[PDB]
Write a protein that binds this ligand. Structure first.
Ligand SMILES: [K+]
Ligand SMILES: [K+]
Ligand SMILES: [K+]
Ligand SMILES: [K+]
Ligand SMILES: [K+]
Ligand SMILES: [Mg+2]
Ligand SMILES: [Mg+2]
Ligand SMILES: [Mg+2]
Ligand SMILES: [Mg+2]
Ligand SMILES: [Mg+2]
Ligand SMILES: [Mg+2]
Ligand SMILES: [Mg+2]
Ligand SMILES: [Mg+2]
Ligand SMILES: [Mg+2]
Ligand SMILES: [Mg+2]
Ligand SMILES: [Mg+2]
Ligand SMILES: [Mg+2]
Ligand SMILES: [Mg+2]
Ligand SMILES: [Mg+2]
Ligand SMILES: [Mg+2]
Ligand SMILES: [Mg+2]
Ligand SMILES: [Mg+2]
Ligand SMILES: [Mg+2]
Ligand SMILES: [Mg+2]
Ligand SMILES: [Mg+2]
Ligand SMILES: [Mg+2]
Ligand SMILES: [Mg+2]
Ligand SMILES: [Mg+2]
Ligand SMILES: [Mg+2]
Ligand SMILES: [Mg+2]
Ligand SMILES: [Mg+2]
Ligand SMILES: [Mg+2]
Ligand SMILES: [Mg+2]
Ligand SMILES: [Mg+2]
Ligand SMILES: [Mg+2]
Ligand SMILES: [Mg+2]
Ligand SMILES: [Mg+2]
Ligand SMILES: [Mg+2]
Ligand SMILES: [Mg+2]
Ligand SMILES: [Mg+2]
Ligand SMILES: [Mg+2]
Ligand SMILES: [Mg+2]
Ligand SMILES: [Mg+2]
Ligand SMILES: [Mg+2]
Ligand SMILES: [Mg+2]
Ligand code: NA
Ligand code: NA
Ligand code: NA
Ligand code: NA
Ligand code: NA
Ligand code: NA
Ligand code: NA
Ligand code: NA
Ligand code: NA
Ligand code: NA
Ligand code: NA
Ligand code: NA
Lengths: 202, 148, 57
RNA sequence: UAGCGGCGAGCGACGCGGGAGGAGCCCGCCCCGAAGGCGCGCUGUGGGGCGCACCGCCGCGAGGGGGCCCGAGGGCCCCGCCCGAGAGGGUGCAAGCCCCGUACGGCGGGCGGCGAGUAGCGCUGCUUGAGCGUGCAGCGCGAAGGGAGGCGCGGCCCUUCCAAGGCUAAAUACGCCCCGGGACCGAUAGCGGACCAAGUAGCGCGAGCGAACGGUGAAAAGGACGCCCUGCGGCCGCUCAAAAGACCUGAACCCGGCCGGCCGCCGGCCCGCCGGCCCCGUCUCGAAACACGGACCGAGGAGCCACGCGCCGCGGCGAGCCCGAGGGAGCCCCCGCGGCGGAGCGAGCGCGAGACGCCCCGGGCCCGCCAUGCCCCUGCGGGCG
RNA sequence: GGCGCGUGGGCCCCUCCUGGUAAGCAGGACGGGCGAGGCGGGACGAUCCGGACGCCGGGCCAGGGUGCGCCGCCGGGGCCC
RNA sequence: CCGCAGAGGCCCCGGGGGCGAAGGCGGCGCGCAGGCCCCGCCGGACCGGCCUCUGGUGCAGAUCUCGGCAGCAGUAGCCGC
RNA sequence: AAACACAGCGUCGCGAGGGCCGCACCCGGCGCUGGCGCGACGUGAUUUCUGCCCAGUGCCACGACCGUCACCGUGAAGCGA
RNA sequence: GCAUGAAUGGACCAACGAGGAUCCCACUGUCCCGAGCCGCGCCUCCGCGAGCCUCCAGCCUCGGGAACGGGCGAGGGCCGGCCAGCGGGGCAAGAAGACCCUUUUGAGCUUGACUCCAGCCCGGGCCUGUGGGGCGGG
RNA sequence: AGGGCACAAGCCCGCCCGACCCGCGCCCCCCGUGCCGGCGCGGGCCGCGAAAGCGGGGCCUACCGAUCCUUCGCCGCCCCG
């Protein structure tokens, strides 16, 4: 008696004719080398400007990644007003601007205003009157301009008496009451009308 | 490697282990899973109960990050505290400097009640608790809290 | 084209090839079909016996 | 993995997350009105929002003799030199130092205003995972604030965006042709096609079909002279290390001469006597069969690879584990998320495990689903059984 | 206990049966054999009588036989186209 | 376990070779065997024992494919005009 | 060939805005035609004849609209489907 | 009258027919019953020179055996090599039986098989104007 | 068709609807799968009888049917801003 789990793989399509549906990866090392060469050439062409732009810090979407940050597309106009800059100037000094995005809370605005202030503190501009030597002395930045770092959680301390004042002495009853409130009201309403049938007939 | 395979040890024998009376033909029973209720009914009934038919209601698009719900048992709580702080907190069974643990920061939503706890007060913040989890926590001197 | 209908010619020899297997020694003491009132009383008498009760403390 | 599916066989997306790359804008409508691209154009040219605030080219390029013996040594013995060059190819036999190359260079390149036979709806056809409709289309009807939120209809909210006009680099794909490489084939193989003439010779009214054929030697040195012969040819010798003489080597089947024997295989023997022996492969209850295939010889000739599932063995780590894509100029070095495991059951709202044990089996308890009794707070909610 | 292959046309003997005038016919049953079992014998045979097998030397002997082919025999009692 | 083709190593002054490699023909020896080794003649430039790795890896058959070729046989036949 | 054709015999449809056929569409043939015509069928020179059946199936009614038989349209109910 | 019959035409019929059938005259190797002859081939020679087929081989009788042997058991015969003829054997050769059956293998044709499509007929709407009138239901 | 049955399992009379609700196990056929059929139980509610008792139909061995779809019934859950 054969006892197996059934396969869930689709039959192949277009094997001897039609479009080519097979992808090989023999060019992986060559693609690596080519991408690096392109990056190096482009960096040489714009020295000493960094390859990347400064981009905002945003929260990851759903409830599953709620408490962490990543890199976003561009800063909103409210943040720029917080630092007193225009979209033209921001794009001039290497800042990404996204007028499609809207802030949903003040904590995001504060975080990104602080980010902009740091970047402006760390940025230097060269005039067309600067001699060629001091331009040669500049260092070209690598990678992401200022990476987003998520710290690991720590353990704090509190008072048992203070915490005992913030919850009822039967918390499970409290939680189960809030979960069932909508369905318990539906039963009550249907029961009251069922009583109106008792009196309406007499 | 082909040197060590069983097929290479059948050269000189004529039918290669498939028999004389039967032989090796193409598809003597059909292709795939065909015949499940007909000539393969015995096989399907012995090993695959609940293969045919429908059952339950259907959702046209499941929202995958709404149904997500990780849980932690009350006996894994103290492992979230590093060892040095661990011995420090255990030594002083303080009621004014009790450790505070927020399991949501570690990636959990609900606290269940399998296992036991060390005898020492502690504060635990979560979004939901089980009935027994709260009972065991309060018998060791701790208090549960709800965190945004 | 007719073929044979039935034979038991070789079946007794095949049965004895590895001996006649006896049942397991746990099939004799199963509770599979015993009277429920008897089974319930047996459970409660054991639990209240201090010398054979598995209740903790 | 939601779903579609004689709910059978089968089929099947997207979001969130991690990377490569990164760039934004215009027209109409509205204001001015020929200021314009002036033989055009007012049936609208031209200009504007109005108030608050890596490729190619060129070059140079080191270092060995003596003896023995061979048709010729790159061979054998002895003793040396060069090295940013001991990748290779050629040369009369295995060459860093006999020749060309290889390593090391240089040059050039507040106001105004947002798109109609349209969107949508009814009926019908195709299409999709899209399920009382995923996208499109025909016909009929046809608008003002409008669209969407993976089950329809009516009502009230919230969250989000503005169709029926237009432009845009990068990260991605890929044959011919050119360059480089290979645990690939080695002349019945490899492309049909290694051959001064292949899509050729040849076949078909035509659309089309389509072969076979590689190799003397270091050097053509490609065969002196002489003697027979009516000529055709023959002998003898010549070149060469060798005829290797239209050519490397030259097997099997089949055959001619000379020389020895008299019927196949196995066994015994002082060798032709004695004894034994049906034709293999195959389907079949059963083959020596008047069952089929097989004249003979050579070469070729048939369970490999990819993905999925189950179980077994071994290695590393272990409540954890993990060369993902990719990034660092290191095929082998460094960094590098999901995922799977860690808790189950339940159609679902959801609820959620400790009590025993070297191991195994079995009992006993605990969690979820179903049904009940008692108690009580915050109550079709909690607790105990 | 786990994983897995082949097989799923059978036939014959002994004794016991059913249909059929019968059949080297068709269909069943306990045990054995051939299939898949070499060797000696039954003149000759897949199955009968003995005996179930590595390569050899020696001995004993089952079944069946002992005029000659062709290894191996006599004695006694009875019958005899 | 024997054998075939190829890859990475070893082969005590750096494995065997025009003082003659591969291949062919004939003959001993070794091994239960698949096979291996040596000797003589031919030939004229390459070859491989052991350890690890890899596979388009072993033929008597397929009315098998391609090539060569026998008996039949000095046979049938070389009769229209 | 006893098969097919044949002259002859008979039936059926159509007066052009029609009939029969082609044809994806646009458009065509009979038709440079008009009932002494065109198209569709059966029997098969001459002579002599060709009986009965309209229950079945088929065809036909400028027969009839009895019952049934669509979308559309319109009436009632409904928050709307 | 198994089971004739009237344009699915009945009956009859002169002329005609490489049509099917019976008889008579004449004629004859069709025959009784075969004989003789002519030319070409065959046959022998010089020149030239193939195909098919082929497990191996090639004498019989009986037995047993896949129930009709060249080979096996038991008997009987036979130097070896060739020619002209011949048609008893070699279950002679020529072809994966066309008859019969099976396969969840086809195709041609038919229809009152089952599921449908062109075509045609019929109704309403759009194309689609400008006037008058009748009837039946609000 | 074969078994069974005598103050009865037959016949007559009286009252009734156990020809019920919830949940398990076993037997037969058998791969120890399904289906039909039967039997043994734990609870609820009932009938008859003075009571003990018996009753999940016609004394026993035959009298019948999956997935998908439709329809009906109790109590609840979902339509995912
Ligand atoms: K057969
Ligand atoms: K035959
Ligand atoms: K006619
Ligand atoms: K009629
Ligand atoms: K005729
Ligand atoms: Mg073979
Ligand atoms: Mg099979
Ligand atoms: Mg076979
Ligand atoms: Mg059978
Ligand atoms: Mg040089
Ligand atoms: Mg060289
Ligand atoms: Mg717009
Ligand atoms: Mg489709
Ligand atoms: Mg919704
Ligand atoms: Mg582009
Ligand atoms: Mg070739
Ligand atoms: Mg011999
Ligand atoms: Mg002999
Ligand atoms: Mg076969
Ligand atoms: Mg067969
Ligand atoms: Mg047979
Ligand atoms: Mg055989
Ligand atoms: Mg070969
Ligand atoms: Mg079979
Ligand atoms: Mg028989
Ligand atoms: Mg067999
Ligand atoms: Mg046996
Ligand atoms: Mg003797
Ligand atoms: Mg040479
Ligand atoms: Mg190969
Ligand atoms: Mg061969
Ligand atoms: Mg001749
Ligand atoms: Mg009649
Ligand atoms: Mg008539
Ligand atoms: Mg007639
Ligand atoms: Mg023969
Ligand atoms: Mg013989
Ligand atoms: Mg003849
Ligand atoms: Mg003959
Ligand atoms: Mg056949
Ligand atoms: Mg055939
Ligand atoms: Mg069948
Ligand atoms: Mg068909
Ligand atoms: Mg009574
Ligand atoms: Mg009861
Ligand atoms: Na060759
Ligand atoms: Na050579
Ligand atoms: Na035999
Ligand atoms: Na056959
Ligand atoms: Na043959
Ligand atoms: Na246990
Ligand atoms: Na024998
Ligand atoms: Na050799
Ligand atoms: Na091969
Ligand atoms: Na006529
Ligand atoms: Na046909
Ligand atoms: Na039954």
């Amino acid at each position: 008696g054969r006892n197996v789990a059934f396969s869930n793989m689709r039959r192949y399509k277009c094997t001897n004719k039609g479009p080519n549906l097979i992808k090989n990866w023999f060019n992986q090392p060559a693609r690596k080398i080519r991408r690096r060469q392109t990056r190096l050439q482009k960096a040489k062409a714009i020295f000493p400007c960094p390859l990347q732009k400064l981009r905002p810090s945003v929260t990851r979407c759903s409830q599953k990644f709620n408490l962490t940050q990543r890199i976003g597309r561009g800063f909103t106009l409210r943040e720029l007003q917080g630092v007193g800059l225009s979209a033209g100037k921001a794009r001039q000094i290497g800042i990404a601007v996204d007028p499609r995005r809207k802030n949903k809370s003040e904590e995001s605005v504060a975080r990104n205003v602080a980010r902009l202030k740091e970047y402006l503190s760390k940025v230097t501009i060269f005039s067309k009157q600067a001699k060629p030597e001091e331009i040669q002395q500049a260092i070209q930045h690598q990678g992401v301009v200022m990476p987003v770092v998520n710290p690991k959680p720590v353990i704090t301390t509190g008072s048992i008496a203070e915490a005992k004042k913030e919850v009822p002495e039967n918390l499970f009853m409290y939680l189960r009451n809030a979960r069932t409130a909508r369905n318990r009201a539906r039963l009550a309403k249907r029961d009251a009308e069922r009583e109106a049938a008792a009196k309406t007939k007499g | 490697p082909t040197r060590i395979r069983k097929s290479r040890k059948r050269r000189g024998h004529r039918q290669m282990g498939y028999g004389r009376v039967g032989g090796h033909r193409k598809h003597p029973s059909g292709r795939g899973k065909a015949g499940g209720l007909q000539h393969k009914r015995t096989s399907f009934d012995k090993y695959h109960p609940g293969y045919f038919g429908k059952l339950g209601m259907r959702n046209y698009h499941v929202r995958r990050n709404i149904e997500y719900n990780p849980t932690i048992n009350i006996d894994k709580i103290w492992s979230l505290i590093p060892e040095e702080q661990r011995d420090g907190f255990l030594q002083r069974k303080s009621t004014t400097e009790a450790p505070v643990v927020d399991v949501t920061r570690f990636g959990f939503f609900k606290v269940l009640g399998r296992g036991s706890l060390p005898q020492c007060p502690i504060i635990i913040k979560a979004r939901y608790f089980s009935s027994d989890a709260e009972k065991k926590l309060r018998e060791v001197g701790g208090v549960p809290l709800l965190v945004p | 084209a007719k073929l044979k209908n039935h034979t038991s010619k070789n079946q007794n020899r095949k049965d004895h090839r590895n001996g006649i297997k006896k049942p397991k020694k746990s099939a004799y003491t199963s509770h599979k079909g015993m009277c429920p009132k008897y089974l319930r009383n047996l459970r409660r008498s054991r639990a209240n016996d201090p010398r054979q009760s598995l209740r903790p403390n």
